[PDB]
Amino acid sequence: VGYVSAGTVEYLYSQDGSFYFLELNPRLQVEHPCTEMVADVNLPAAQLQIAMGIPLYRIKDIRMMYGVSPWGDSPIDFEDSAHVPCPRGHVIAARITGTVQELNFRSNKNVWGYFSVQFGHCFSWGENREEAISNMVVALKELSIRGDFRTTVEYLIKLLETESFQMNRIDTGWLDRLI
Amino acid sequence: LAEEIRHMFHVAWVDPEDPYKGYRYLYLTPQDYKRVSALNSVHCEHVEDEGESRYKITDIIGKEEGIGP
Amino acid sequence: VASPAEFVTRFGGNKVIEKVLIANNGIAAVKCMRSIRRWSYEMFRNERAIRFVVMVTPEDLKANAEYIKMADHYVPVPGGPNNNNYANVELILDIAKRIPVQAVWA
Amino acid sequence: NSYVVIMNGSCVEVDVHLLLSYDGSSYTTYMKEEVDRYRITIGNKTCVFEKESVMRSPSA
Hints:
The structure is cut from a larger assembly and holds four copies of chain A. The first copy, chain A, is built from seven helices and six strands; from the N terminus they run ββαααββββαααα. By secondary structure, chain A is an alpha+beta fold. The longest helix of chain A is centred in the C-terminal third of the chain and has 17 residues, at 129-145. Chain C: It is found in: Cytoplasm, Cytosol.
């Protein structure tokens, strides 16, 4: 269709190995920093660059990821450089329930978050899955001591420690049975 | 007649330096427009015209329902 | 580069956006402003390279949401459901035609 | 909605969505499949089962 911006293509994937498209969000989502932290891609900045007509091979965010020169202008064959990116660590986002209060954590420099007035989201980065979950635990234990995330976060804090989350063996109905 | 608009519109002249040359349209300043604007009062077009920005009148509805044809 | 216009040339773009009108509220604007400004700071070492024009509804301001004060220019729009504010294209147009503006971020 | 588990010529009908609605409530069981073992994890618990009495040739 000639898309010109940041977008999210949503899919449902089955154990068979079959997948299905759900929708395209022609806009930013609230949880986009998850990608930003592992991709080192500033998404709203990327949205801005696209509106200026910057080709993908000329986007800074993309340049480090595809292992090329920081200032060259050579077009990149994105198919040919499929193997260069390997994700760098893990990010977990959790919805917790002014108007938007950014809750900064002293326990970890790689973890930050917010609660808004109403609802919010917290984002925890780590060098790898284990390290990021570890950082989340200390932050969420720290988070219960915080104000906007006390009642909401208790049932939530419980859910994150279950083996299913540890093993990434969850689905759309998971949380609803955890409480 | 819809007084509320009658009393706040401004005139967009064909030529200000000679009124007898006709006027182009009646309009509201954006401030004047910005008040009836909330209320489904007239149909206008925002316009920049003769240098100045005017709110061109396309139809008069008359806010009182029932005072029309 | 000295300005958003210079960035576009070096990297092969075709539309200069130096001023963005934000058709939105909440956390998006806060992460987005810092995120664009952080990248712009990363790119230009100046967080105000992209100025922001905002629309202000009665509802959002009394809570003193931090994102409101960051913007560079404001135009009051009617509050309430999206048919009255962020989506009021004519008022946006009024904002767009009067300033005028070069881009909208929703 | 309905899947029928058949034990050696029997029919018990359950339905799914992976969530299953069964007698009790809706429960979660997870499946790791192996060549010769059947390895089920039901929450924080693992149990492992063997595939092994008759020697069946596999081809005609």
